[PDB]
Amino acid sequence: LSCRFYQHKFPEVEDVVMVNVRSIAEMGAYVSLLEYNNIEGMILLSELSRRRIRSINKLIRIGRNECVVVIRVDKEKGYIDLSKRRVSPEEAIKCEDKFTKSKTVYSILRHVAEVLEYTKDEQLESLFQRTAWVFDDKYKRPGYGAYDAFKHAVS
Amino acid sequence: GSELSERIESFVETLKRGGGPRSSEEMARETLGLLRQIITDHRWSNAGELMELIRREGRRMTAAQPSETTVGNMVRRVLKIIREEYGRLHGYAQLQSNIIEAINELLVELEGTMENIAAQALEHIHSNEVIMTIGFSRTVEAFLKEAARKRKFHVIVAECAPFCQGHEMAVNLSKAGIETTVMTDAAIFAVMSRVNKVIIGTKTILANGALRAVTGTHTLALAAKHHSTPLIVCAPMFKLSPQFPNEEDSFHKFVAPEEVLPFTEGDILEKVSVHCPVFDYVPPELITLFISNIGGNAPSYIYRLMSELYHPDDHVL
Amino acid sequence: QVPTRKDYGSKVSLFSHLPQYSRQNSLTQFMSIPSSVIHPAMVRLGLQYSQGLVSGSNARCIALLRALQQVIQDYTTPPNEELSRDLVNKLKPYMSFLTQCRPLSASMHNAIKFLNKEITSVGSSKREEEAKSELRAAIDRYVQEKIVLAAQAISRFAYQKISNGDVILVYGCSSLVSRILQEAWTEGRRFRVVVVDSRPWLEGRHTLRSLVHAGVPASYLLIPAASYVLPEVSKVLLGAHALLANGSVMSRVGTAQLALVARAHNVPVLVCCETYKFCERVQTDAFVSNELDDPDDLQCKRGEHVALANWQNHASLRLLNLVYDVTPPELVDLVITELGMIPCSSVPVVLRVKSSD
Amino acid sequence: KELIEYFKSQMKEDPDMASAVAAIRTLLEFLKRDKGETIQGLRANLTSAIETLCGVDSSVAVSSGGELFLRFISLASLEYSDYSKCKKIMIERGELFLRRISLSRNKIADLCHTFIKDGATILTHAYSRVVLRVLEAAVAAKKRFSVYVTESQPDLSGKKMAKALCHLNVPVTVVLDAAVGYIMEKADLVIVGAEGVVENGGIINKIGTNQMAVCAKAQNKPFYVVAESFKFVRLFPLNQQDVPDKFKYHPWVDYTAPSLITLLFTDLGVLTPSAVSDELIKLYL
DSSP, X not given: OOXXXXXXXXXXXXXXEXXXXXXXXXXXXXXXXXXXXXXXXXEESTTSOSSOOSOGGGSOOXXXXXXXXXXXXXXXXXXEEEESSSOOHHHHHHHHHHHHHHHHHHHHHHHHHHHHTOOSXXXXXXXXXXXXXXHHHHTTOTTHHHHHHHHHHHO | OHHHHHHHHHHHHHHHHSOSSSSHHHHHHHHHHHHHHHHTSOOOSSHHHHHHHHHHHHHHHHHHOTTOOHHHHHHHHHHHHHHHHHHHHHOOOTHHHHHHHHHHHHHHHHHTSHHHHHHTGGGGOOSSOEEEEESOOHHHHHHHHHHTTTOOOEEEEEOOSSSOTHHXXXXXXXXXXXXXXXXXXXXXXXXXXXXXXXXXXXXXXXXXXXXXXXXXXXXXXXHHHHTTOOEEEXXXXXXXXXXXXXXXXXXXXXXXXXXXXXXXXXXXXXTOOOOOBOEEEEOGGGOOEEEETTEEEOGGGHHHHHHHHOOGGGSOO | OOOOOOOOSOOOGGGSSSOBOOSSOOGGGGSOSSOSSSOHHHHHHHHHHHTTSOOSHHHHHHHHHHHHHHHHHTOOOOTTOOHHHHHHHHHHHHHHHHHHHSOOOHHHHHHHHHHHHHHHSOOTTSOHHHHHHHHHHHHHHHHHIIIIIHHHHHHHHHHTTOOTTOEEEEESOOHHXXXXXXXXXXXXXXXXXXXXXXXXXXXXXXXXXXXXXTTOOEEEEESTTHHHHTTTOSEEEEEEEEEOTTSOEEEESSSHHHHHHHHHTTOOEEEEOOGGGBOSOOOSSSSSSOOXXXXXXXXXXXXXXXXXXXXXXXXXXXXXXXXXXXXXXXXXXXXXXXXXXXXXXXXXXXXXXXXXX | OHHHHHHHHHHHSOTTOOHHHHHHHHHHHHHHHHOOOOHHHHHHHHHHHHHHHHHHOOOXXXXXXXXXXXXXXXXXXXXXXXXXXHHHHHHHHHHXXXXXXTTHHHHHHHHHTTSOOTTXXXXXXXXXXXXXXXXXXXXXXXXXXXXXXXXXXXXXXXXXXXXXXXXXXXXXXXXXXXXXXXXXXXXXXXXXXXXXXXXXXXXXXXXXXXXXXXXXXXXXXXXXXXXXXXXXXXXXXXXXXXXXXXXXXXXXXXXEOGGGOOEEEETTXXXXXXXXXXXXXXXXX
């Protein structure tokens, strides 16, 4: 029982997303996008660093969460190109805080759906769209708007 | 500011008094964090002024403890990173964030070292093998305790006489079930007739392929050269030092002789001369193979890693 | 899908992790006759490899690249998929089938790595057959230079080393050493070659026929009698299959033994290897990465009492024929590549100038 | 032949001057005096110049320095397309390379004399300025040691080395050249000057060296070899006849196995013997 974190199923261009590396290949590093229902992405071998890299396993760390910037996206082909070279430490801290707030909102709505015993993923996605994605579309801020609305609703 | 010098002096007398922290990868992370704190808490116009600054505090940190080379080679690697960025920006203001992201890349390189050696560890272990190690090192015990997941073999952990730290390695490998045999340090040539290969760690790799390590392992290297068994030095690349062996006789670290001859021996302690060197020198001709996180390298290849990680103008620090 | 082969016989306790197959066993008993899971060229390559018809390293890599050319020529692209990912996702079951037929040579591993680096470097804005012809031309140029230009360069570098009145020792079957001896005999050097052979391949007869047909006076010998001839032998030439990062020489099994007896008789060792047969992988013995052939190949017919025929009745009987072994780097003197004469200590260093750095 | 006359005038004006640097200066003077606008026309003239310098002087360092200079000319010809600016580029780059080479010996002295312990024993071979420069930097660094120099029978230059060290007021002793295995057990380190380094890590030196090397092998003594970077040779001698016979003429040159050599002390630093092949493969002859 899982869903994505925002109302869009695919991230936009130059959008820093939080991923976890699952496997390493010759073309790049296969990752999973934790805030987009674990869709498969790829960090390129040319984009892993700004320095000459002899091997992919020196900086991959399969099992570690990392912030990567999206370089190319294709909804038809299903290809998502990611990059660790383009992201800044300030953008990495911003993506870490945004992923932490979105994961807190995801855990809150998962506990709410477990209390409501909604075993179907479509009813849970409708609950997502009626609770968090409506505020995210109203405030035009994915992750920040839903967490801000929940912090205001707690008071 | 002032808190920087607080942390620097705390690190300096921490290295002066004892081993703080215990293992070396935490110490390398502390050194890189201290170096990024030094480059983020100062003001400079040229890169050479920060270069002279880092050379001065590197001199201070290696004058705190001359026997431990990890802080010195980390300072030298940061110096070569700064030199490479100044050379690639010379052929100005964006230098600081470039050194910050380079230090972050070095931290991601450094946190995944032992598990990369463990990933390449299966290329050196076959079934029903006799392994002999010396001392205690978490890289070699992690190596063996994950290589025993698909292979079944034997590890003979020999204790070292100043501090029998191989008992901890024996009880850590025996929990994984690798049929660990515990012996002394005097039976190595007594058991070298059956040991197929020698898989040890080290403290510091020198520039010529030689290495200082836990004491008694030069004897093990001599016995393994006599029996022509290959030596596996499972060592990371932050123990790589450009310091040559014959250099002002500051090689060995001597400790208190209480562990060799106790204070309750008698009046004979006055007319005796007890030395306890906890480190030993192994030449490169008694070494077969080094295993780093980037792969296996020859002792005839340590100069290339030296010139790729260090600069010859920073050997004096 | 492809199942795993039944490992034949009783394995050695030190070789429990390495597979041991048979030649009377083959994988295609439970496979389609129009091969759909594996390519027809790939299953043809696997049958040519499993039966022992292609045993030389350069011949194995050349037939592998020809099968890869037939794979790329018979390749189609599915919709909403890129070539640079689907090709590496489809070639990995092919290489797994090839490994399942026989443990791969290191020349095949370096060819796999170079092909993966080449088909990773294809931009998706290119067309289908344009990129296919570019990759076919890249494979052709790669095998062209790193076979014939490397062989001509190593033959030219060995022609200036072999003198007149010399006696040369060879072992096994290699195309490079045979081409070196043929070009040295035809270009003016007068010498005689001592051929050392070993059981159970008996592949020294191939280079013996290559030396007699070239007009060279030959001498055929075995590995125990090489100690009889090494006081006579002035130079030992060997054909290397792989060179490792410590300087070890992975070749046929009677190499480090022969190099040790040659050093004991003060005869220098000259291995002949190309720059594409190098490895970043390193091993220090013949036990952690090796090929195991059939256990039924060691038997012989010396009269009427073939003793290793029904060897499987004895539970305490192990049969073993090692294929590859490594040499200590202090035993081999020369390494003759197309860049010149190096020691073994520059095996990874040439890799550093062959890794685009 | 003005080239051999200029070579002998450059080599005889300074007794502290090596043959290889005089050959490189002669080659630079011949390239400045050529003024021929041709790549192959300059390459053939340089090859005839090195042919004359090898027919006159039978030293290995002369032909080594000419091959490095020829590789430098080939690199400078392959870099610049037009020859008019390339001539001045070759002249300026060769003058700057000779200025870098003429300061090499002092660099060897300050980077090499650090290894020698105080109160130790040095074993050394025949006369060369490099081991004198290393030893005078060692005694300028306030070190005391006892020196044993080989008498070196074919030309009694080790006695001249001992005279130059007694004028330096250091304890030196002419030891018999048949006694290098007699004093090997007292010699804790053996530092030797070489005249040519082959590709694998071995060296080309005077005839009494290689046996001393195996005396350093059976008795576990560190055999240090000291040589500059212009003595790097792109050869592979396997046996003792496999050196080129034009440098022999009672043999004059012994090939020393690279396994018998502990360290090298070049302008790149204190190196393993495997570093010479690295420099020779990125130099590409």
